[PDB]
Structure 1
Amino acid sequence: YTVITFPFLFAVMFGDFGHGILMTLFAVWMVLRESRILSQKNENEMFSMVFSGRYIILLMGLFSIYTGLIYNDCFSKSLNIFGSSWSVRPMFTIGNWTEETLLGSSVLQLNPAIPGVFGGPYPFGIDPIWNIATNKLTFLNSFKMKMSVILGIIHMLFGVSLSLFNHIYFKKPLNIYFGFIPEIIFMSSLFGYLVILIFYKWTAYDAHSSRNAPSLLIHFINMFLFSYPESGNAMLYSGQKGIQ
């Protein structure tokens, strides 16, 4: 049931394009030589484990290649394919941040970071400009944590949902109608709400929409904790209190 969606093919989270191609090359050379490898004597028990795992190693290499492509970090150096979005001349000429040729190298060291008339995501992955920037850490941290939450919630939801089929196969209607429905209900009501909130925050805002303060990063991911007793303020869109 799992194979690919298992936590053994998303067992990369380190895809660096080149690292994936290296793993695939090693595993492919080893699979091409498996005949003489099994025909010849074994080298060491670790080699025996690697021989038992060759198939998983190769397919994990393919998935690492794909994850490196979507991450757009080839040996920690990004790849520019079919545009990169962003610019500087529109940001400075329109934004009155011009005449910083040498003044920007004398007065505004590492200062300029403002979106003017911009936007539009990379058609495939993450823009290389985020890689060559210095706010890379914050944006990547927020993106990876949100991807974390969504991936983990959908995975655990699928894992629990498989148990419903597992139990309906083994008759037992009392447990199905009394033991696992509460589990799914609680899990959904506590985590799918967080996932939907993450997606809503992602979709229902824009660059020139931060509340008063310039950026605020996210400012709503964590203050909506697992209890949120009262007060809160900030984001209080109508109905959210009642739904909570």
Structure 2
Amino acid sequence: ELYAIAKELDSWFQDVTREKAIFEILNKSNYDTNRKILIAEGWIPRDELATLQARLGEMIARLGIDVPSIIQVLDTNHTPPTFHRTNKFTAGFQSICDCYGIAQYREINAGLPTIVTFPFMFAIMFGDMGHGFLMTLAALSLVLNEKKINKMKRGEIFDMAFTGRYIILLMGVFSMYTGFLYNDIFSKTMTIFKSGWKWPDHWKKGESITATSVGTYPIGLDWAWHGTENALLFSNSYKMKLSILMG
């Protein structure tokens, strides 16, 4: 009997959990025993009134209730809640944005600009190709297996990262960009693009050598700056100005 009941017990629990909420909700409806034609209110998305009315009518026809069901919109003097029909593409960004504070009744939800600004603000702070690439692979580990992870307990292995599959992906691709524009796979600078500063062709064994501005490096910080005694000063001035301008 235990083996027999175990098959339906798991489904029976999730079935029976419904009515608790059902009666807790219709509790707010104020269905007095003497009163008939129960009257109540609730918050809906305005663009879904027609579809909810259609579904209710379809159910009433299915339920055989001869009396028609009607619904009317009140004068919304009281402030209604704020909603955002976010998809899985941006639900993480929206939730992280609203962690600070829920939006005003109809204001411009800050989630939408943050969707991009937060990953790029992180990336302009992060920089490296290699670390960003490994963390982008880590993000792919949850993005690709999103179907599997959705039905497996987050626990302490992922925890808040359960929703972070797409956030980490976008900050990783922006880390890629910041690497292209800071020119450092991990720390080491790459040299695909055209040669930058041309330090003088004749050099002594240990002489101090300056460089010549023969041109401008097209994409990002000039690889010639690497290893130089003025590299820290140049890069720091550069990215002070970059930070303040972007800010």
Aligned-partner Cα distance in 2 for 1:85–1:41 = 52
**C-alpha separation between the residues in 2 aligned to 1:72 and 1:82?**
10
Alignment of structure 1 residues 32-111 onto 2, 5 Å: 32-44=144-156, 47-88=158-199, 91=200, 98=202, 100-102=203-205, 105=206, 108=207, 111=208
- Residue 28 to residue 141, structure 1, CA distance change in 2 (3 Å): same
The CA distance in 1 between the partners of 2:211 and 2:130, in whole Å, is 33
**TM-score, structure 2 normalization:** 0.50
- Matched residue of 1:7: which SS? helix
Alignment match, 1:123: 218
Q: In the superposition, relative to structure 1, how do residues 8 and 85 fare at CA in structure 2: closer, same or farther (>3 Å)? A: closer
Q: Moved runs in structure 1, 4+ residues, more than 3 A? A: none
What 5-or-longer segments of structure 2 have no aligned partner?
A: 1-111
Residues 130 and 185, structure 2, Cα contact 8 Å, conserved in 1: yes
Q: TM-score, normalised by structure 1?
A: 0.50
Structure 2 CA distance, aligned partners of 1:22 and 1:28? 10
* One-letter code aligned to 1:23: M
Inter-CA distance 9–125: structure 2 relative to 1 (3 Å threshold): closer
Correspondence 1:195-210 to 2 at 5 A? none
Conservation of the 8 A alpha-carbon contact between 1:72 and 1:126: yes
Distance, in Å, in 2 between the alignment partners of 1:101 and 1:9 is: 44
Work out the percentage of aligned pairs sharing the same amino acid: 45
Aligned to 1:147: 242
Instruction: Return 77-86 or 137-146, whichever deviates more.
Output: 77-86
| Alpha-carbon shift at residue 8 of structure 1 (Å) | 4.0
Residue 118 of structure 2: SS of its match in structure 1?
coil
Which residue of structure 2 lines up, in the alignment, with residue 6 of structure 1? 117
Map of 1:226 onto structure 2: none
**1:24 paired to 2:126:** no
Asked whether the 8 Å contact 1:4–1:10 carries over to 2, the reply is no
- CA positional deviation for 1:33: 1.4
- Cα shift readout 1:2-34 (whole Å, capped 9, x = no counterpart): 034423432122121111211111111211112
Please say if residues 71 and 126 of structure 1, whose CA atoms lie closer than 8 Å, have aligned partners that are also in contact. yes
Greater CA radius of gyration, 1 or 2? 2
**CA drift at 1:58:** 0.7
SS in 2 for 1:2: helix
Where do 1:132-143 residues align within 5 Å? 132-143=227-238
Structure 1's 123 and 20: CA in aligned 2 closer, same or farther, altered over 3 A?
same
